[model samples]
Each structure stands twice: as structure tokens, then as C-alpha cells.
Target: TFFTGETLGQVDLIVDAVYAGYKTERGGMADPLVPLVGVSRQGGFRYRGTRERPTLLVLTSNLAEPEWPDQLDETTGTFIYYGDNRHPGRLLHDTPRFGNQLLRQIFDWAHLGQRHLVPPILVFTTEATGRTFRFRGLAVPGSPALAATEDLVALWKTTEGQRFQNYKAVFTILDEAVIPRAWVHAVGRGETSGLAPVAWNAWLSAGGIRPLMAPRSLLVRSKAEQLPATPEDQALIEVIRQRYKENPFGFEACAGALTRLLLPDVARLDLTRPWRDGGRDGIGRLRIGQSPAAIEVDFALEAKCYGANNAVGVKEVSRLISRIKHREFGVLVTTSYVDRQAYQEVTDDGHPVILTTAQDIVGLLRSAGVRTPTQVDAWLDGITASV
Candidate 1:
């Protein structure tokens, strides 16, 4: 724990360690990094040095932004960050913070063989209080496994009848165990990283990225874990449930989209026609690995928009599994839970089936920054109105 205005803040930065905010004698708390790093105390993106060529970048996320959510995965060693275009009628990079411009320069510098000029990205998340934060990891732009096109994406969204662009940056968290206090203070003093982390220098020199991958201790998730746990999340599910209840057949598109969200590598998802009423709602090929050695693997999709109380029967699961061809898997999506045996039979038989329940739907939406019902409404409209 690093106490504000104390010697603790003067210490090294460790992975997944908390840095406590300064508690004033009168009341309230002050920003801890203000004194420690000389960076501003506001906004998600803060940096030392110029926007075009920052010596160090401090990236923070609440993990609860409605439209522009920031994502981090320890196991995957990747961070998906949306730019600072939080409102309407403004150009993507014309924000007060200029964070989007910063993102642009950073990605450009990385791909243009100016990797040595790239700064160290320090990731922090607000978990406990707004003042307090946890140091997630030290990251660099892109990953060794990801291609140039696959990373650093630009996305469009409409708000207030205005459509604008935003950046979705992919950063690979490096395996630097401890960032010495010397580097932070060095960057704060407007100097270069004379005492940078070894892993950081490794990437700069040889373009090597040793990602800090932390695999989950528990391999399988329980039934409760798969379902929606929070009331607000349940409401997110309900929003979709009611919207598509009468026209349940249309949910297959959303199922396909959510599947695309889950598996970004899905090359193409062609929905089956209504008159056909085939066993599977959609058939898709998933691209695996980098483009140089990628393989196209096929899969089938089934969507069942059941009510809260309605648990999808084992018959549906069995039918999807049986109809799916060998070497290809199946995806079962439902607005409600699945029957006990359906859950039991798949794991027992070791069938290659991916089950996405109501809770899973909420999780994916929320993770994508569609946390509130209003955002859900907008999101559903975007996909439902599209082919």
C-alpha cells in the first residue's frame, strides 16, 4: 500500500498492487499520482510529455463506462481501450483531453518502425474508490501474435443523430515484474526512461513482446457463474428479452453478433433463411491464428429467446449437437437458462458446444460498454435494423 504524501508512494510499482489516495485531515481524499508522477488527476488518459511523443502514459479505467468501456484480461494479456470521444457532434480527435490523438500517434509510431520512441504504458483501474487505484500492468502497443490489421481498430457509433469515430487500441501487457520508482520519477522530470523496465527495453530493441499471461486457476465455470448475478445485469438481459419476445425469430442476428463479439475471429456468419427453418440458425467459419498460418474452422449457431423462467430443454441442445458436422462445433444462445441435463450432458460427453445464456448476454454487452438499458436499446436497434 502506497500512502499519499508518504514514503510508500516513493516505492516501486508492482503488478496488481494498490496505491492508496491521500486522505486529508479535514475530510475527503486527494489524487495520489498527482504528487508521485506529476500527471493530471482527471480523465482516463493521462500522460507525461507531449501528446505526440509521450515519455510515459498513465491509462486508467473505471471498467464501467457505458459507451466507451475499457477492457483488460490477465489470462489473455491484452487491453482493449476506447478513445476519448465520449459525446456527440465533435470530431473523434477534437476532445479537450486529446486522448484520441494521443492514441493515433502512439499506434502510428509503433507501426512505423519507431518502436524505440514509443513510451511505456502504465495501466491502472479504479476498483475500490475513485482516488485509490490498482496498477494492472506495464503495456506496449499491439501483440506479437496479433497482425497489424487485427490490432488498433477504428469503430463508429451514433449518438444524438450524429455518427463519429473512435479508436479501439489493443495493447499487450508485458511481463515486467516490478517497475522501479526511478523510471516514474525520471519521466516526471521530463527526462527519458534511463531506468526503464528490462522487458520494456527488450521490446524496443528486438521487437520482442513477452506478454504477462496469467491463466485462471479454475478451468470450468459453474452454472451460477454462467448466469447473471447482479440485478442491473438481469435488467440488461430483460431489456433484450422484452424487445425480441414477440419477434423471437429475429434474435438469431443478435446471437450472431454476440457470437462475433465473443469470437472476434469469426470470418463470416451467414444466417439461415426463415422459410428454410434449418436445424441451425447460422453457420460461420472462425479464423484461427495469424493470417500467415490461419485456418478456417466451421461452426453452427442456435438461438432461443426464452423467458426468464423458461430453461432451454436438453432436446434443443441435443438436436444442435447431433446436427452439427464432425470437426465443426455448435453454439447455443438463449435468453434464459438451460436445463440441468443439457448442461450436464455436454460436459459429460465432452461435446464441442458453447453455451451462452441470458447472463452471458449481459456480460458481453456490459463488457462492450453497453451497461445501461438505454445503451442496450441503442445497441439492439443498430443490429436489429441491419442485415
Candidate 2:
């Protein structure tokens, strides 16, 4: 097994790169069986069509426990998973089954019935550094599951009664490649998407498709339209600010408030300060924390409060990106939108930055216990105009 320091650094680099540049594209065909699942084969089972939906299982081989990042190592690995009840994916279900661990787990039911297995393309990631050497050749798909008519989850967990009970899969993140990385192959042309051979190959060749969740910026705009400010909302907004003052980066105050006005699952609020070197107003440090133990002074926020023309410009974005080098993660809270140039600059630089806007801040206030929509709206207007 690898040492803790090396593993953490490697995984952390991969996560950061994914956050910075990972883009999922659609497969060529819209096959019903798009996902791949992993299973352990102690016995075999057959699929009973019509009654039960067929599912594909994508499994991972042996993997060791993740090593936490220590002072000696500046790198760290923080697993991030996103999916809802409708599509839990492997991370949610298997992670819990494996003692709440997030590093490596199984994929019991990855594909649907009657669908072809879309192979996964493996990337060569260093075990010590976690850097991607290059993309590897696509793996051939294999039949990992024994078909059963029973519910997919039910069938897997109940082995004594089911013939395929012994079938199981274990995923690991060791140095060697034990199992092929799997992905659902899909494709779309222009805007129109369909199920075609090309689509399937494209999905197999590239990565799986990902649905577009609503952006946090859009949510803030919607909240502004639905609920303007009122006296009570304004009072609550004050409470939010007070809470932010107490736990600037906790998200309980700033981000918490926004969650109520907007949807619950958006990740768009940050509070941090600027750096001593080429930083903005002392207001910079007003935003975020550098690490668990240190307070960061160089901070800037990106918000969506201003109008289209007034949204943050390239000059402001450049300044904010500079601050990111000094801080663990930079701040962005917008009352206005960010211009394309500004947006591109921050993204390209590969720094830790948080972004939000005026409307976004108001949304945060509302979510953080500022129940009065009207009051919060009015208060936010005032704050944006002045702050």
C-alpha cells in the first residue's frame, strides 16, 4: 500500500483538476442501458425481462484506505459526489455500505435492462503525485451482472434466497489497474441527441453524459423576481451578516441564507479577505479563512448583483485571481454578473476562488433564517448599492 502523504496529494490533484477542467459530454446513442455496474460473481443469475428492469453493475477492484493530508504534504484529497434520489450513483449507496468511506466503492447497478455496456476510458494517474500522464485506450465491455427479475438493490443485498447472491464486486484505488474504468457511452449532435451507433461509440470513446443542474447565479435572479424585500426580511438580513461575521466561511450564515432563497444544493457563496501583497481594500480580509488555523487577509468576492454592463469586469477578475495564490480559496459573491473575460480569467488561472452576486447574497440571507423575503430583498438592494 502507498503511504498516506503520497495518496492524499495524488487524489487532491485529480479532484482539483476535475473541478477546474472536467467536462462530461453526451454519448452517440440514447441507449436505455447507459450506466455500468460492478458485481461479485459467486454464482450466476438470469434476467427476467418485462417485470424487472435490467441493470448493469460496474465494480472496482481492491483499493486501500485514503491517507489524510498532513503538514509535510501541502496536497489533500476531498471526495465530492453529486447526485439526487433519482440517480444516487455508486458514491452515495456504496460509500455508505463501505463504512461511510468515500475513496473506493462498488457499483452494483450501473446500467439499465436491454442496454449495451459502454466501456470506460482509463487515465494514467500517478500513485504518488496523482498527476494524469495521459488518457489510455478504451476498455472492452464485459457482462458483470447475472440478470434477475427482482428489484436491482433488493436482488444484490439478498443472496441466500437469490441464485446470484454470491455475485459481488469490490473496487480499489491501488497502483495497478485491476479493473477497467467504466463510463456510459452517449452522444448528441448540435443540440439534438439520439441513440445511434456513433453516439454509443462516442460515449464509449469519450466520457458519460451529465445533466445540467441550475446554476447558483440563475437561482439568485429567480429569487429576486419572486420575493422582493420586506421589513422582516431586512431584519433577518442583519442577522445573516452577524452570523457571517462570526463564521465567515462556515456557510451557515452567508451560504445558509442563500440556500433558502435559492435551491438547497447550490455551491456558490464564499467569504474571505485579500492578501497583503497587491490586495484591495482592507475589506479583502473581510471574506474568508486561509486554513483551519489561519485567517487570510487577501480576499475578493465575485457577485452577481450588478447589471449586465455593471457585472464584474476583467480588471476586477484579474485582481481577484491574484489574491487566490495567497489564500486557500478566493471569494466571489456577486450582486451582478461576471463578464466572459473575467470568468475566463479566473477559470484559466487554476486558483481557489468563490463567486456570488448581490441577488445571491440576498438568497443566502433568506436561507440562513431570514424568513421575510421582502425585508431581505430591500436590505440586499441597499447593501449592493452601497457595499
Candidate 3:
């Protein structure tokens, strides 16, 4: 654990390691990069040296990313980073946060055959804490899979009846495991002294990137993994539960809306009125492909507005299982969790039941920018009004 300002003052970033924040009642977890790379202590886009001649770049993300889905998919070896202009109705490149300018410049150099002129980007993201940051990996501006024109693009978002633009750039994280402290120390002093990572050096010398691709290590998620880990995300779940506990039937409409977000291809969904629903709380059609002749698979959706302490059990799961007809699947959304026995019953019997538990609900809602209780309360109200 690299405590804030407590380490040797010189540290090498290790992939997936949690570098911690202040331990005492002192203050916020000071930015570790400030001491390590001499970068600024604020903002997601941070750098050393100048934009014209950047020696190192440090990019941070909460990874909720809010409506843009800033994802670091280890399976795909790609990181989709959104620009710094998160606020509404501002010029894209003209913003004070000039991360969009840097992104445009970073991609231009690589695509213009000046790849070596570009700087190596260090990626970090916040998972469970405001102070702690997790190292993602060393990344380049573009990925191997995307075309030149598709690498960096200006994305538009409309808010408060005004429109603004932001950058949605793709970065390829290299397979190099360790970013040597020697290179950082040299670069920190504005000199490209030696000990550069092999993959980084290869990309610079030949424009070749060894994209870091690692498949999922586990096939199943434990109960702990299925639950929200962060205090912020945990509170997001409770917002839904506390609001819907007395009028839990309201959650059926919410469950359908959350399902639509998760499966944007949900062509049509009709929420079953409170007492009219026999076993299923909602019915929907999932489109498999984008084609006009794409298959529409029928599915049953159920909602349980249980508190965090409660678990969706076998009885609840079996109700949906028995209700689904042949060629139809089931979706069960719960504000709490599914029990081991209930989860196992579906897997053991090969029941086509998709479980959307608290973790998933918070994740989908957060990504959609319904993060706070105020926002969630409004979102629930909107869904109720629409239904």
C-alpha cells in the first residue's frame, strides 16, 4: 500500500494495485502523481512538461464516467476515455480543462506517422474511495481494433435545452507489466533518460502496440462481487429501496426501465399493473440484432423492492421460472441480492433467468448519471409518470 506522501517519495506504478490516501485525520488523499511524476493534483487529465512536448501523461477516471461509459475492458485491451468538459453548454476544445485539445493532438500525431513524437499515457481510476486510485496500465492514444477516423471523435450531449460537445477517445493499454521508476524519475526531471518499457519503446520505434488483453479470470461472481462495494454506489441502491419499500409495486416499472438501459435493444416492454400480474411483473421483447429482420426474443421481468438486508430467494425465482413459456427467458431485478440457493436453482436446472441485483442496478443507474438520491428519486418519478 503506497500511502499518500508516506512512501519513499519515489514509486513505480504496479498494475491493479491500490495506492492509498491519507491515513490520519489530516486531509484528502493527496494525488500520488504530484510527488511521483510532478503533475498537478487536480482534474482527470493531468500531464508533466508541456502539451507541445509532453514527457508523461496521467489520466484519471471515477470509471462511472456518467452517461459516456468510461470503460477499461481488460478483455478487449481498450480504454474509452471521455473528455474533461463534463459540464453542459461549453466549447469543446476551448474549455479551460483542455483535455479535449490534448486528446485531439495525441491522436493526430499517431495517425500522421509521428507516433514516436507522442507521449506515453499512464491510466488510473477510482474504484471505492475518493483518495485511493487503481493503476490501469500504460496506454497509447489509439487502439489496434479501431480505424483511424474512429479513434477520436467529438461526441455531443444535450442538457438544460442547450447542446455541448466532448471527446470520446479510445486508448490501447500495452501489455507491459511494470512502468520502471527510472524512466519516470528521468521524465519527471524533463529528460527521457532510459529504461523505457519494451512495448512502449516498440510502439515509439515502429508504431506497434502490444495491446494488453486478458480474458475473464472467473466465470462466476460471488455474493460479495455481486453487491455494490463503494459507499457512493451502496447509497445509490438504498435510494431506490427506501423510496419504494412501502409502494414496492412502483419498482416494477423501474425494473423495466433499468432493463431497457441494460438491454437497449428491448423493442417493447409492457409493465403489468400491480394486482393484474400473475407471476411476471413485466413482459418485453429483446431484439438480437440490428437488422430489420432480427429476431425478437420474448422475456418475463420481475421486480423485488427488498432492502439490502433481504435476499431474493428460491420461492421468488421459481415463480418466474414456472411462468416463462418455451422459447422465453426471465429477468429478475432486486434492490437487494439473490440467495445462493436461488442462483443455483437456475444454473442447476438450466433455467434461463437473468439476475439484475443491487450491483447491476447501481452500475446502470450511475453510468446513466442518476447517481445521487435526488437524481434517483427524480428518475423513479419520471419512469412512474411515463408508465
The better candidate by TM-score, 2 or 3, is 3
TM, every model: 0.76, 0.28, 0.70
User: Ranking under lDDT, best-scoring first?
Assistant: 1, 3, 2
lDDT for each residue of candidate 2 in 102-179, tens digit (9 for 90 to 100): 111112223332223322322222222222122111222222222333112221222223322112222111121222
Kindly give the stretch of ten consecutive residues in candidate 3 with the minimal lDDT sum: 272-281
TM value for model 3: 0.70
Residue pairs clashing, model 3: none
Q: Model 1 — which ten-residue stretch has the worst lDDT?
A: 272-281
Residue pairs with backbone atoms closer than 3 Å in model 1 (clashes): none
lDDT of 1 by residue, 1-387 (tens): 444458555777888888877777657677766765568767678888776678778898888765676889889889888888767778878988898889888888888889866777889888766478788888999987777776787788866677788888999999977888778778666576568778888888888899999997523445576678778988888888889868867788899899988885854888864323444347778998778998888888888888777777788887777658664788888888887777878877778998898878887886676878999999999998876
Compute the lDDT of residue 85 as modeled in candidate 3: 81
Residue 345 Cα positional deviation in candidate 1, in Å, after optimal superposition: 7.3
Ranking by TM-score: 1, 3, 2
Instruction: At residue 1, give the lDDT of candidate 2.
Output: 25
Q: What C-alpha lDDT values do all the predictions have? A: 0.79, 0.32, 0.79
